[PDB]
Design a protein around this ligand. Structure first.
Ligand SMILES: Oc1ccccc1CNc1nc2ccccc2[nH]1
Length: 284
Protein backbone atom coordinates (compact mmCIF):
# COMPACT_ATOMS: atom_id res chain seq x y z
CA UNK A 1 0.00 0.00 0.00
CA UNK A 2 1.49 3.39 -1.17
CA UNK A 3 2.73 4.78 2.22
CA UNK A 4 1.37 8.32 1.33
CA UNK A 5 -2.21 6.83 1.34
CA UNK A 6 -1.49 4.69 4.47
CA UNK A 7 -0.33 8.07 5.99
CA UNK A 8 -3.59 10.03 5.34
CA UNK A 9 -5.63 6.91 6.47
CA UNK A 10 -3.74 6.85 9.89
CA UNK A 11 -3.85 10.72 10.17
CA UNK A 12 -7.61 11.00 9.38
CA UNK A 13 -8.32 8.10 11.86
CA UNK A 14 -5.76 9.56 14.38
CA UNK A 15 -4.41 6.00 15.08
CA UNK A 16 -0.64 6.89 15.31
CA UNK A 17 -0.54 5.72 18.99
CA UNK A 18 -2.16 2.34 18.03
CA UNK A 19 0.29 1.60 15.09
CA UNK A 20 3.29 2.53 17.36
CA UNK A 21 2.09 0.13 20.10
CA UNK A 22 1.70 -2.69 17.44
CA UNK A 23 5.43 -2.21 16.56
CA UNK A 24 6.42 -2.21 20.29
CA UNK A 25 4.46 -5.49 20.74
CA UNK A 26 6.01 -7.33 17.69
CA UNK A 27 9.61 -6.01 18.22
CA UNK A 28 12.38 -8.58 18.84
CA UNK A 29 13.74 -9.28 22.32
CA UNK A 30 17.30 -10.64 22.64
CA UNK A 31 19.65 -10.89 25.63
CA UNK A 32 21.81 -7.91 26.80
CA UNK A 33 23.85 -9.76 29.48
CA UNK A 34 27.22 -7.98 28.88
CA UNK A 35 25.51 -4.49 29.27
CA UNK A 36 24.03 -5.53 32.69
CA UNK A 37 27.37 -6.79 34.27
CA UNK A 38 28.09 -4.72 37.44
CA UNK A 39 31.57 -3.66 36.07
CA UNK A 40 29.64 -1.86 33.18
CA UNK A 41 27.09 0.16 35.18
CA UNK A 42 29.01 3.49 34.73
CA UNK A 43 29.31 2.80 30.89
CA UNK A 44 25.48 3.10 30.46
CA UNK A 45 23.67 6.43 30.36
CA UNK A 46 20.16 4.89 30.76
CA UNK A 47 19.31 1.66 32.70
CA UNK A 48 16.50 0.72 30.20
CA UNK A 49 18.66 1.20 26.96
CA UNK A 50 21.19 -1.56 26.26
CA UNK A 51 22.78 -3.11 23.20
CA UNK A 52 21.91 -6.78 22.42
CA UNK A 53 24.81 -9.19 22.92
CA UNK A 54 24.60 -10.51 19.31
CA UNK A 55 25.02 -7.04 17.62
CA UNK A 56 27.12 -5.05 20.20
CA UNK A 57 30.34 -3.29 19.11
CA UNK A 58 33.38 -4.76 20.88
CA UNK A 59 36.37 -2.56 21.79
CA UNK A 60 39.76 -4.18 20.84
CA UNK A 61 41.20 -4.46 24.36
CA UNK A 62 41.48 -7.43 26.77
CA UNK A 63 40.55 -5.42 29.95
CA UNK A 64 36.87 -4.52 29.21
CA UNK A 65 35.53 -4.60 25.62
CA UNK A 66 32.12 -3.05 26.45
CA UNK A 67 30.53 0.13 24.90
CA UNK A 68 26.82 1.00 24.61
CA UNK A 69 26.87 0.71 20.75
CA UNK A 70 25.16 -1.60 18.19
CA UNK A 71 25.85 -2.55 14.51
CA UNK A 72 22.67 -2.15 12.40
CA UNK A 73 23.41 -4.21 9.17
CA UNK A 74 20.75 -3.69 6.44
CA UNK A 75 21.33 -6.62 3.96
CA UNK A 76 19.03 -5.57 1.03
CA UNK A 77 19.91 -1.82 1.23
CA UNK A 78 23.69 -2.70 1.57
CA UNK A 79 24.09 -0.05 4.37
CA UNK A 80 25.57 -0.45 7.90
CA UNK A 81 25.21 2.04 10.83
CA UNK A 82 26.63 2.09 14.34
CA UNK A 83 24.02 3.51 16.75
CA UNK A 84 25.40 4.61 20.16
CA UNK A 85 24.48 6.70 23.23
CA UNK A 86 25.87 10.21 23.71
CA UNK A 87 29.26 9.60 25.38
CA UNK A 88 29.64 9.92 29.16
CA UNK A 89 32.53 11.67 30.98
CA UNK A 90 34.13 8.24 31.55
CA UNK A 91 33.38 6.82 27.98
CA UNK A 92 34.74 9.68 25.73
CA UNK A 93 38.04 7.71 25.24
CA UNK A 94 36.05 4.47 24.41
CA UNK A 95 33.92 6.42 21.87
CA UNK A 96 36.99 7.61 19.87
CA UNK A 97 38.62 4.14 20.22
CA UNK A 98 35.46 2.69 18.54
CA UNK A 99 35.57 5.33 15.72
CA UNK A 100 39.27 4.41 15.09
CA UNK A 101 38.87 0.57 15.32
CA UNK A 102 35.74 0.46 13.09
CA UNK A 103 37.35 2.81 10.42
CA UNK A 104 34.39 5.22 10.48
CA UNK A 105 34.68 8.43 8.35
CA UNK A 106 31.69 10.33 9.86
CA UNK A 107 30.02 10.94 13.27
CA UNK A 108 26.36 12.10 13.13
CA UNK A 109 25.17 13.98 16.30
CA UNK A 110 21.39 14.78 16.52
CA UNK A 111 21.33 16.47 20.01
CA UNK A 112 22.76 19.55 21.81
CA UNK A 113 25.14 18.99 24.77
CA UNK A 114 22.54 20.73 27.01
CA UNK A 115 18.77 20.37 26.40
CA UNK A 116 15.89 21.07 28.87
CA UNK A 117 18.53 22.48 31.29
CA UNK A 118 20.36 19.08 31.75
CA UNK A 119 23.50 17.58 30.15
CA UNK A 120 22.54 15.09 27.36
CA UNK A 121 26.18 14.16 26.44
CA UNK A 122 29.80 15.05 27.26
CA UNK A 123 31.68 17.82 25.35
CA UNK A 124 33.64 15.06 23.45
CA UNK A 125 35.31 17.17 20.63
CA UNK A 126 37.54 20.32 20.76
CA UNK A 127 35.91 23.75 20.32
CA UNK A 128 39.16 25.63 19.41
CA UNK A 129 41.88 24.77 16.85
CA UNK A 130 44.73 25.56 19.31
CA UNK A 131 43.24 23.45 22.24
CA UNK A 132 43.42 19.76 21.14
CA UNK A 133 42.06 16.87 23.32
CA UNK A 134 44.14 13.89 24.47
CA UNK A 135 42.35 10.67 25.68
CA UNK A 136 45.06 9.06 27.90
CA UNK A 137 43.10 5.81 28.62
CA UNK A 138 42.88 4.96 24.82
CA UNK A 139 46.06 6.85 23.61
CA UNK A 140 44.27 9.09 21.00
CA UNK A 141 44.61 12.83 20.07
CA UNK A 142 41.78 14.84 18.47
CA UNK A 143 42.23 18.36 16.92
CA UNK A 144 39.57 20.72 15.43
CA UNK A 145 40.79 21.46 11.83
CA UNK A 146 37.80 23.60 10.59
CA UNK A 147 34.11 24.36 11.37
CA UNK A 148 31.25 25.40 8.99
CA UNK A 149 28.27 26.77 11.02
CA UNK A 150 24.93 26.91 9.09
CA UNK A 151 21.37 27.75 10.25
CA UNK A 152 20.17 24.15 10.91
CA UNK A 153 23.51 22.22 11.35
CA UNK A 154 27.32 22.55 11.67
CA UNK A 155 29.98 20.41 9.86
CA UNK A 156 33.39 20.07 11.50
CA UNK A 157 36.61 18.67 9.98
CA UNK A 158 38.69 16.83 12.70
CA UNK A 159 42.06 14.96 12.82
CA UNK A 160 42.14 11.76 14.97
CA UNK A 161 45.66 10.48 15.66
CA UNK A 162 46.50 7.03 17.04
CA UNK A 163 49.40 8.08 19.36
CA UNK A 164 50.68 4.42 19.43
CA UNK A 165 51.41 4.28 15.62
CA UNK A 166 51.28 8.05 14.68
CA UNK A 167 48.68 7.26 11.96
CA UNK A 168 46.15 10.12 11.43
CA UNK A 169 42.65 10.21 9.82
CA UNK A 170 40.14 12.89 8.70
CA UNK A 171 36.88 12.52 10.78
CA UNK A 172 33.84 14.59 9.65
CA UNK A 173 31.35 15.60 12.44
CA UNK A 174 27.79 16.28 11.19
CA UNK A 175 25.94 18.13 14.00
CA UNK A 176 22.18 18.67 13.60
CA UNK A 177 21.67 21.61 16.07
CA UNK A 178 17.92 22.59 15.70
CA UNK A 179 15.89 19.51 16.81
CA UNK A 180 13.37 21.04 19.30
CA UNK A 181 13.57 20.30 23.09
CA UNK A 182 9.98 18.78 22.89
CA UNK A 183 8.22 16.99 19.97
CA UNK A 184 9.60 16.70 16.38
CA UNK A 185 10.30 19.32 13.68
CA UNK A 186 7.15 20.67 11.93
CA UNK A 187 8.69 20.18 8.40
CA UNK A 188 11.23 17.43 7.49
CA UNK A 189 12.92 19.78 4.99
CA UNK A 190 16.01 20.68 7.09
CA UNK A 191 16.45 17.04 8.39
CA UNK A 192 16.40 15.70 4.72
CA UNK A 193 18.81 18.47 3.66
CA UNK A 194 21.14 17.30 6.50
CA UNK A 195 20.86 13.59 5.49
CA UNK A 196 21.83 14.53 1.88
CA UNK A 197 24.91 16.42 3.18
CA UNK A 198 26.05 13.33 5.16
CA UNK A 199 25.52 11.16 1.99
CA UNK A 200 27.43 13.64 -0.24
CA UNK A 201 30.42 13.44 2.15
CA UNK A 202 31.15 9.73 1.46
CA UNK A 203 30.53 8.91 5.22
CA UNK A 204 27.70 6.36 4.44
CA UNK A 205 29.60 4.64 1.58
CA UNK A 206 31.03 1.09 1.54
CA UNK A 207 34.65 2.24 1.09
CA UNK A 208 34.58 3.38 4.83
CA UNK A 209 33.59 1.67 8.11
CA UNK A 210 29.99 2.30 9.31
CA UNK A 211 28.94 5.87 10.20
CA UNK A 212 28.61 6.43 14.01
CA UNK A 213 25.16 7.94 14.85
CA UNK A 214 24.04 9.23 18.28
CA UNK A 215 21.55 11.38 20.20
CA UNK A 216 21.21 11.09 24.03
CA UNK A 217 20.05 7.41 24.24
CA UNK A 218 20.95 6.47 20.62
CA UNK A 219 17.45 5.09 19.75
CA UNK A 220 15.00 7.97 19.06
CA UNK A 221 16.35 10.71 16.74
CA UNK A 222 19.18 8.23 15.84
CA UNK A 223 16.47 5.70 14.79
CA UNK A 224 14.73 8.34 12.61
CA UNK A 225 18.01 9.12 10.74
CA UNK A 226 18.83 5.45 9.77
CA UNK A 227 15.15 4.47 9.06
CA UNK A 228 14.71 7.41 6.58
CA UNK A 229 18.07 6.78 4.84
CA UNK A 230 17.42 2.98 4.41
CA UNK A 231 13.79 3.50 3.22
CA UNK A 232 14.85 6.09 0.51
CA UNK A 233 17.76 3.81 -0.63
CA UNK A 234 15.33 0.83 -1.02
CA UNK A 235 12.90 3.09 -3.05
CA UNK A 236 15.90 3.83 -5.46
CA UNK A 237 16.88 0.12 -5.80
CA UNK A 238 13.51 -1.71 -6.23
CA UNK A 239 11.41 -2.06 -9.44
CA UNK A 240 8.29 -1.10 -7.36
CA UNK A 241 9.12 1.77 -4.91
CA UNK A 242 5.55 1.45 -3.48
CA UNK A 243 6.58 -2.03 -2.06
CA UNK A 244 8.77 -0.31 0.65
CA UNK A 245 6.97 -0.92 3.98
CA UNK A 246 8.43 1.49 6.65
CA UNK A 247 6.93 -0.60 9.53
CA UNK A 248 8.70 -3.75 8.20
CA UNK A 249 12.02 -1.88 7.75
CA UNK A 250 11.74 -0.57 11.39
CA UNK A 251 11.09 -4.11 12.75
CA UNK A 252 14.12 -5.42 10.78
CA UNK A 253 16.25 -2.60 12.35
CA UNK A 254 14.82 -3.44 15.86
CA UNK A 255 16.43 -6.89 15.53
CA UNK A 256 19.79 -5.06 15.98
CA UNK A 257 19.04 -2.37 18.67
CA UNK A 258 16.03 -2.10 21.04
CA UNK A 259 13.56 0.81 21.11
CA UNK A 260 14.39 2.54 17.75
CA UNK A 261 11.75 5.34 17.34
CA UNK A 262 10.74 6.32 20.93
CA UNK A 263 7.29 7.98 20.28
CA UNK A 264 4.26 7.94 17.90
CA UNK A 265 5.27 11.52 16.85
CA UNK A 266 8.79 10.25 15.80
CA UNK A 267 7.04 7.40 13.79
CA UNK A 268 4.79 9.99 12.03
CA UNK A 269 7.83 12.29 11.39
CA UNK A 270 9.72 9.26 9.82
CA UNK A 271 6.79 8.65 7.39
CA UNK A 272 6.80 12.41 6.48
CA UNK A 273 10.56 12.53 5.85
CA UNK A 274 10.44 9.41 3.56
CA UNK A 275 7.29 10.63 1.71
CA UNK A 276 8.86 14.10 1.14
CA UNK A 277 12.37 12.74 0.38
CA UNK A 278 10.77 10.45 -2.28
CA UNK A 279 9.08 13.63 -3.72
CA UNK A 280 12.64 15.10 -4.18
CA UNK A 281 13.56 11.54 -5.51
CA UNK A 282 10.90 10.25 -8.05
CA UNK A 283 12.16 13.13 -10.30
CA UNK A 284 15.13 14.67 -8.32
O1 LIG B 1 44.38 13.81 8.37
C1 LIG B 1 43.72 14.14 7.24
C2 LIG B 1 43.90 13.35 6.06
C3 LIG B 1 43.23 13.69 4.90
C4 LIG B 1 42.38 14.81 4.91
C5 LIG B 1 42.21 15.58 6.08
C6 LIG B 1 42.88 15.29 7.29
C7 LIG B 1 42.69 16.13 8.60
N1 LIG B 1 43.82 17.07 8.94
C8 LIG B 1 44.15 18.22 8.17
N2 LIG B 1 45.15 19.12 8.32
C9 LIG B 1 44.96 20.05 7.23
C10 LIG B 1 45.71 21.21 6.87
C11 LIG B 1 45.33 21.95 5.75
C12 LIG B 1 44.19 21.56 4.97
C13 LIG B 1 43.43 20.42 5.31
C14 LIG B 1 43.85 19.67 6.45
N3 LIG B 1 43.33 18.53 7.04
Amino acid sequence: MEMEKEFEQIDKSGSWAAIYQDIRHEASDFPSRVAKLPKNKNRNRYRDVSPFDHSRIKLHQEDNDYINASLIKMEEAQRSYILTQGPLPNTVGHFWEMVWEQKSRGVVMLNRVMEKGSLKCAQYWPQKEEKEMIFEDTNLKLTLISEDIKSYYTVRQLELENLTTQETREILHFHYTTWPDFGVPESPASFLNFLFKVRESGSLSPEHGPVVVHCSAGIGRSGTFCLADTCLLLMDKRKDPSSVDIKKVLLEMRKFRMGLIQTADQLRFSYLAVIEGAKFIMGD
